[PDB]
Write a structure and sequence with these properties.
2 domains, homotetramer, hydrolase (chains A, C), binds nicotinamide-adenine-dinucleotide, binds adenosine, alpha/beta, globular, NAD(P)-bd_dom_sf (chains A, C), nucleotide-binding (chains A, C)
Chain lengths: 412, 418, 412, 424
C-alpha cells in the first residue's frame, strides 16, 4: 500500500531522518509533550507536501500523536526517494517519487483520499500550494462534509484559499500556517540548488531576481553573499523601496536580460520570464524558478522554440536557440531548491512544521465547536498568537540562545 | 512668540532645510498635491517632536496645507538650534533649544497648548513619545473635548496609548504612525547610531565587542550597523521570536551579565527601564561606552552612576566620563538620552520623509473626519492604523529619488493578483 | 593505458567539460593565442592534481599547446569520475577515481613517471601539494636530472618546496603559482561541500574555523553570510588581528569545543582537532577539513576510539563516542570542498590554471639557458609580474567589467 | 614658539588625547618598553603629518623616547585645533590650524626646518605625502647631508619617493611604512569615509548610487562602508587585477561617464589627478555629492567647478554648494581635500596605533643605524621596508584590547611550519 522509486533506499533514508530529528527540536518536543494524550487519535490526514527527509519527520510526529496518514508530494521533482522509502518501510501509505509525470502526479494525490481504516475516507487535509484542496472540493464533493479542516503551508496556497473564499467556493475552514522562515530558508537553499545543478561560480555574476517578498529577499541575500551583483524586479512600491534600501538596483527584466548570468523567479505569479526575454539572453544564461508553480517561466515556449535540446543530467537542460547561444534551464522551471537540491534545511523547516502539527491539533480538537465552521461560514484563520512564542522558544536551546527574564517591575 | 537658543542661526538652518527638502520628496509632493485644497485649514496643531532640520520640513508642509502650529521638542538634547531658529524666523511659534533643563522642557510643552487664534486653543495633537498626550489628558481636562485627534510617531508613544486605553484613560482617538518602523526604525538606526557614537567619541568600531539590548526594528538596525564596521555584537532579548531572529542573523544571544566585563560598547534599544544597572557598571572594562537609543533615558541607571562615581569629567557637551571606585572609567553618552539625536543629527531626512509623510496624512485623516464618529471622542476612543492603500502611496513617492523602476503588470497578471 | 572508475561516464563528463570551458576564458584564450606556435611541443608533463572537470580543461589546454601528459589525482576523494572518463576516452593517460585506497593512490602516481614516448620518461612536473615532487626526488633519483621544472598550485606544496630548498634537498627549479583566489573559491565551495554532505542549516550555528589565511578568510565569510556565528583560531598575530577587525571572536579550540556545531580546519598544519577535543563536542557536531592534508584532524584516533560507526553515505560518517554523543566526519577528513562537492567552481579555477599553463611554458622554453637551474643552484621563482595583469584582463569580459583608460598625462 | 588657532582648546585637546591613549596600546607599550633606554635621544625630527588627536599621541611617544620635534600638518583642512593646542601647551613647537591658506601651509612647514637645539637643524624626517621631503631636497640642499632618514606614511608619498629615486633625485634613504596599509587604509576608510560625509551633509547612504573611483585598499574600504549602509556602489578602475576583485566582491565596474547622471555620491580614491572633471560636472544630478579621500585634492577639478559655477553658497565650513548653468546643484566637500580628515576626525585611534607604532620603529631603526651605512645618504640611497619580524610585534600589541586569544604552536607543529615557536 505505497508507491515509491526504490524500497531498498529505506535504510539510507532512516539514517538521514535520524540526523534531521536532531535538527528539529520543535517537532521532537511536540512528540514528548503530546505523545501521552494522543490528541490526533481519530484524525485521518490526507497530506500533500514535498516528500522530503524533513517531511518524513513531520509525518512521524503526526503519527506519534495518533493520526493515521496517507501521503503524496506536491511537486513532481521534489520527493527525496530515500525519505519516501524510509516512510513506506514503516507502513505509512505514501505515493511519491522524484521525476513523476503529470498523470502520475494526479494519480498519487488520488491515492490519499481513499484507503484509510473504517469507511476509508480522510477527515483532515494537510496541503501546500492547494492541489489536494482543489482536488477534494472540485472532484470529491461527497468528501467535503467529511473534512473538519485544512492546514496550508505556503503563500501560493494561501492566495488560493482567499481566491475561493471571496467567491463562495471554500466549504472547509483553513488555518494559514504560512503567515521570516522562507527568507532564511531560500538564503541557503537557492544557491545549493544552482550549484548542485551547475557548479557555476556565483562571484562576479549579474543576477536577476524577480520579486522581493520573503523569498526574493532570501534569494537576493544568498547571491549577494557570494559576490553576485543582484538586480531586483518588483511590481510593488513597498518591496521596491525595501530592495533599494538594501542596496539593490530595481529595474525591469528587459533592462538586464542581455547581461544577466542568472535569472531567478520568486513571484508566485505567471509569465515573468517569457518569449520576449529568451532571444536576448547571454550565452549559457541560467534560468530557474523558486516560486510554487513553474509557469513563472515560459518553459513550453522555450522547448517549442529551441533549435536544439541536450540533457546535461537530470533537471539540467541546455537549449540551443536560433541565434546560436545557449540557455540552461533548471528542474524544467520547477522549484529549484527542491528540484535540484534538498530544499530548506531541517532547522528552519522545524519551525514551519511545528505550526503544521499545531494547526492540525487546533482544527481536529475543535471539529464539533463551530469554531472552524463548515459550509458558508467557513473562513481562513491564524493559530492563536501565543503559539508563535511557544514554537520559537522550542528552538532556542539548539542555537545556545539564552533569554533574559523580565523583573516583576519590568513586566508591569 | 517663540524661544530658541539663537535667532542668528536662522540663515544656516534655512540652507540645511533646503538640502533636506531635496531628500524628502514624500513631503514635497504632499505640498504640490494638496496645497490647492488647503485640507488642514482650521487645524490648530500642538506639536511635540524633536525640533530638527527634518521636523522643520514637516512643520512647513503642515503650514503649506493650511494648519496653524505651535511646536516643542520631545527631548531635552534633540533640538537642532539652527532648524529651530529658521522656523522661529518664519513666525511659527517654536519653543525648543538643545540642552534644556527638566523645567524648561515642561515650560516649552506648556507654550504649545495656548496662544493660537480665536479662543487660543489647539484642536489637534502630533506627538512623539506621548509627553504632550499625557500633559493634555492629565493636566488640561477642560481641553480634552476640543482635541479631534492624536497622531503618534514612535513605539513607546504607542505603548503608552494602549496602557492608557486599558485603564480607561484614553478620551481622544489616535492614529498609530509608528506601525503604519520597518523603515524609520531599522534603516534609520542602522545609519544614525554609529554617527552618534562617532561624533561623541571618534572610537573605532572594528574589533570591538558590543552589547545591543533588545532586537526589535531599532535593535536590528543598531546591530547591523556595528556588525558592518567589524564589531562583534552580542544581543539580549526577553522575547523568543526576536532572539531566534538574532541568532539566525549570526548573533550570539546572551544576558548582559555574560558580556558586561568584555563589551567595549553598550547600546540599549528596549523601550524599557533598568536595562543597564548598578549590577553592571562596577564590572565594565575601562572606557566602556554606554548609550541609549530608546525613547526614555531610564533604560540606563544614570542617577545611580552619577551618585556613585568617585570623579566626573565632562569631555565635551553630551560626553561624560565617570571614574568608579575601580579606578576604571565609564563613558556615558548624552546622559543616556537617545544617542542619535543627542550626539549627532538623528535619522537622515530620506527615511524621515517616510514617517513624516504618514504623519501629515494622519493629521489630514483625523482632521477631515471631525464630524464622523470614525475616530470617536470620549468612551469609544481607539487607536487606529492609517488606511492601507496609503502605504503604497507613500512608498511610491520615494522611488524616483532612488532611480527604482517598477514593473507594470499585464491585464492577465493584474486579474490574477488583485 | 589509463584507469578510471567508469568509462561510460565520458559522455556526461564531456557535456560538463563543455560548460566549464565557457566559464574559463583564460584557458580558452591561451589555446587561441598559443595553438599555432605549439610552445609545449616536446614537453612531457607528469601531472598530479585533482582530476576534476576544471582540471580536464587544463589538461586539454596543455595538450592543445603540444604537451604530452600523464595524470593522477592528488587526493583519494577529489576525483570527479565523469571528468576522468571523458579524459580517458580522448586517449590521455589518467589514473584516478573517487575513493582510492592509499596503495591505489601511490600506484596511480607511479604510472605518470613512466610510459611516455621515446625513453618513456617525463621532463616536467605539474604538482598540487608536493606528493609527486617528493616521489621523483626521493624515490626516483635517476629521473631528477631529466626534469626541467616544477609548477606548484598550493600553499602546502609551496611550503614543501621552501623546506626542501632550505635543507639543500631541492634539485629542480620551481615556479610558485599559488602566489586572492583561494579566498573566493572556498567562500563558495566550503558550504557547498557541507550541504551536499549533511543538508544542515548554517544560520543559527556556532562555527569554529581554525586558521585565518586566505582559506580561513573565505570559509569564515561563507559561514557568516548564511548567519552562522564564526569563532576563529590563529597562531599568527597579524591574521588574528585581521579576524577581529572583520568582526570575529578569536579564541582557542578548547574555548568553543563544547558549543561549536561545526569545526573547519584551514591551517595546512597537523593535529588541530584532536583526542583532546572529540570527547567534549556537542551531539552531532560536524568536523571537516579544507586544508591540503587530512591529518589536521586526528581521524585514526576518532575511528579507533569510537564505540560505534555508521556510514550515512560515502564520505559522511557518524561516530558514537563512549559518552553516547555523535560526531559527524566529512570525507574522512580530506578536503571537504572536493571530497563532498565539486571543489572551487570553473571561473576561479581559470585564474590559477591559466597561470599553471604559463609557468609550464616559462620553465619549458627556458630549460637550456640556465634561467631555471637544475642541481645545486635550484630555486623557487615567480611568474613575471606583468602576467598577473594579463591573466586578470582575460576574465573581465565574462563579468562585464569595463576598464578605464588612463589619458597620456595620467600615465606619467 | 608655535602657531595654532586657539591655545584655550588645550584642555579639551588633553582630555581627548587621554581617551585616544586608551585606544592606542601599540604606542603606549612602546613608551613603556623603550622609555628607560631613550633610543631617540639625539634625534631631531621634522614632522609633517595631519595634526590630529592621534598624531598627538604619536608626537608624545616620540618625545617620551628622547626626540626633539617640530611639527606641521600635511593638509590645509585636517588639523584638529584642540589637539594642536594641547601639543603647543606642552612646549612642543607645532605650526598647524584647520583652514590654513596655501601660503600659510608652506610657512608652517618652513618653521619645522629650523629652530632646534645646537645649530637649530633637523636630522630626521617623518613625512606623510612627501611635501616636507620635497621641500628639504628641492629648497634646502645645504640640509640634505644632515638628514639621516625619512619615514613615509602614505601611498602617495611612497610613489613620490620611487619617482624621485628613478630620476636620481633621492639622496636620503627612506623607510616605507605605508607597506599598516592592509589595516590603516581599508579598515580606516571603511569607518572614516562615511563619518566625513555624514558630519558634512547628514545624508542617507541607504538607497543611493555611489561612484567609487579606484579600488586599492582605500577604494575597497570606501566601497565596503557605503555598501554596508545599503548604497549601490559602482567602482571604476584602470588596473585589471583590482577591477576583477571589485567584480568578485559584487560591484559593477564601469566608467565615470556610465554613472555620472545617476550617482548621488562620487568618491575619488585613486591617488591620481583629473578623475572628476569638467567632462562630468555638467551631467551630474541635482545635489550630487562630490568628495575625495586620496592625498591630493587635484583628483577633482575644483578650480574648474569654482570658476564655472553660476552660484556658490558655503553651507558651513567645508560644505560648498555650487549652482551650475543648467540650474542644478553640486555639493563639494572640504574643497576636495581628504574628506575623512577634512569633514570629520580622520581614521579612529585604534587603527592609527598600528600605523604610528610602525612610524616609531622606523624612526628608531633609521636613527640607531645612522653611522653604519645600512641606510645610505647620497647617490646610494633607496627605499626600504621595516624588518620582517616587526610586523608581528606590532600586531601582537593590539590583541589584548580586542580580547583576541592566540593559539600556541606545539614543538611538533613549529617543526612542520619550519618556524620558531616569525610564522609567515
Ligand atoms: N521553494 C520554496 O522553498 C518556497 C518557500 C516559500 C514560498 N515559496 C513560493 O514562492 C513564491 C513567493 O513567496 P513569497 O512569500 O515571497 O510571496 P510574496 O507574494 O510575498 O512575494 C512575491 C512578490 O513578487 C512580486 N511580483 C508579483 N508579480 C511580479 C512581476 N510581474 N514582476 C516582479 N515582481 C512581481 C509581488 O509584488 C510580491 O512582492 C510563492 O509562490 C510561494 O508559495 C517557495
Ligand atoms: N532613537 C530613534 O530615532 C528611535 C527610532 C524608532 C524607535 N525608537 C524607540 O526605540 C525603542 C525601541 O523601538 P522598537 O520599535 O525597536 O521597539 P520594539 O518593542 O519592537 O523592541 C524592543 C525589544 O526589546 C525587547 N526587550 C524588552 N525588555 C527587555 C529587556 N529587559 N532586556 C532585553 N530585551 C528587552 C523586547 O522583546 C523587544 O523585542 C522605543 O523606545 C522606540 O520608541 C527610537
Ligand atoms: N581545499 C582547497 O580547495 C584549498 C585551496 C587553497 C589552499 N588549500 C590548502 O589549505 C591550507 C591553508 O591555505 P592558506 O593559503 O590559507 O595558507 P596560509 O598559510 O596563509 O593560512 C594558514 C593559517 O593558519 C594558521 N595556523 C597554522 N597553524 C595553526 C594552528 N595550529 N592553529 C591555528 N592556526 C594555525 C597560520 O598562522 C595561517 O594564518 C593549505 O593546506 C593549502 O594548501 C586548500
Ligand atoms: N584619507 C586617508 O586616511 C588615506 C589613507 C590611506 C591612503 N590615502 C591616500 O589615498 C590614495 C589611494 O591609496 P591606496 O592605498 O588605495 O592606493 P593604491 O595605489 O593601492 O590604489 C589606487 C587605485 O586607483 C586606481 N586608479 C588610478 N587611476 C585611476 C583612474 N584614472 N580611474 C580609476 N582608477 C584609477 C589604481 O589602479 C589603483 O588600484 C593615495 O593617495 C593615498 O596616499 C588616504
Ligand atoms: N526541505 C523541505 N521539505 C519540505 N518542504 C519544504 C522544504 N523546503 C521548502 N519547503 C516548502 O515548500 C513550500 C513551497 O512549496 C514552502 O512554503 C516551503 O516551506
Ligand atoms: N532627525 C529626526 N528628526 C525628527 N525625528 C527623528 C529624527 N530622527 C529620529 N527621529 C524620531 O524619534 C522618534 C523617537 O523619539 C523615532 O520614531 C524617530 O522617528
Ligand atoms: N575544482 C577543482 N579542480 C581542481 N583543483 C581544485 C578545484 N578546487 C580546488 N582546487 C585546488 O586544490 C588545491 C589544494 O590542493 C587548491 O590550491 C585549489 O586550487
Ligand atoms: N586621525 C588621523 N590622524 C593622523 N593621520 C591620519 C588620520 N587618519 C588618517 N590619517 C592618515 O592620512 C594619510 C594620508 O595623507 C593616510 O596614510 C592616513 O594614515
Amino acid at each position: 500500500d505505497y508507491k515509491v522509486k526504490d524500497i531498498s533506499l529505506a535504510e539510507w533514508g532512516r539514517k538521514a531522518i535520524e540526523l534531521a530529528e536532531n535538527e528539529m527540536p520543535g517537532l521532537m518536543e511536540l512528540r514528548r509533550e503530546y505523545g501521552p494524550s494522543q490528541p490526533l487519535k481519530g484524525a485521518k490526514i490526507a497530506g500533500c507536501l514535498h516528500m522530503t527527509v524533513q517531511t518524513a519527520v513531520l509525518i512521524e510526529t503526526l503519527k506519534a500523536l495518533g493520526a493515521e496518514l496517507r501521503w503524496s508530494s506536491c511537486n513532481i521533482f521534489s520527493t527525496q526517494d530515500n525519505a519516501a522509502a524510509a516512510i513506506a518501510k514503516t507502513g505509512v501509505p505514501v505515493f511519491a517519487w522524484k521525476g513523476e509525470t503529470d498523470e502520475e502526479y494526479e494519480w498519487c494525490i488520488a491515492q490519499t483520499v481513499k484507503g484509510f481504516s473504517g469507511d476509508g475516507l480522510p477527515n483532515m487535509i494537510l496541503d501546500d500550494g492547494g492541489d489536494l484542496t482543489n482536488l477534494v472540493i472540485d472532484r470529491y464533493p461527497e468528501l467535503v462534509p467529511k473534512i473538519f479542516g485544512i492546514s496550508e503551508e505556503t503563500t501560493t496556497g494561501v492566495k488560493n484559499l482567499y481566491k475561493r473564499l471571496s467567491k463562495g467556493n471554500l466549504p472547509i475552514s483553513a488555518i494559514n500556517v504560512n503567515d521570516f522562515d522562507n527568507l532564511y530558508g531560500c538564503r541557503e537553499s537557492l544557491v545549493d540548488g544552482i550549484k548542485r545543478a551547475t557548479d557555476v561560480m556565483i562571484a562576479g555574476k549579474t543576477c536577476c531576481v524577480c520579486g522581493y517578498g520573503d523569498v526574493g529577499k532570501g534569494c537576493a541575500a544568498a547571491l549577494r553573499a557570494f559576490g553576485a551583483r543582484v538586480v531586483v524586479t518588483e511590481v510593488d512600491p513597498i518591496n521596491a523601496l525595501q530592495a533599494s534600501m538594501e542596496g539593490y538596483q530595481v529595474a525591469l527584466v528587459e533592462d538586464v536580460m542581455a547581461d544577466a548570468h542568472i535569472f531567478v523567479t520568486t513571484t508566485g505569479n505567471d509569465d515573468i520570464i517569457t518569449s520576449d526575454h529568451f532571444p536576448h539572453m547571454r550565452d549559457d544564461a541560467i534560468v530557474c524558478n523558486i516560486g510554487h508553480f513553474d509557469t513563472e517561466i515560459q518553459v513550453g515556449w522555450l522547448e517549442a522554440n529551441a533549435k536544439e535540446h541536450v540533457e546535461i543530467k537530470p533537471q539540467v537542460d541546455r537549449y540551443t536557440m536560433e541565434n546560436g547561444r545557449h540557455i540552461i534551464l533548471l528542474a524544467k522551471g520547477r522549484l529549484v531548491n527542491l528540484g535540484c537540491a534538498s530544499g530548506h534545511p531541517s532547522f528552519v523547516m522545524s519551525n514551519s512544521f511545528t505550526n503544521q502539527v499545531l494547526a492540525q491539533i487546533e482544527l481536529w480538537s475543535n471539529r464539533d465547536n463551530g469554531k472552524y465552521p463548515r459550509g458558508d461560514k467557513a473562513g481562513v484563520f491564524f493559530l492563536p498568537k501565543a503559539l508563535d512564542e511557544k514554537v520559537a522558544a522550542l528552538h532556542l536551546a539548539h542555537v545556545g540562545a539564552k533569554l533574559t527574564k523580565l523583573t516583576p517591575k519590568q513586566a508591569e
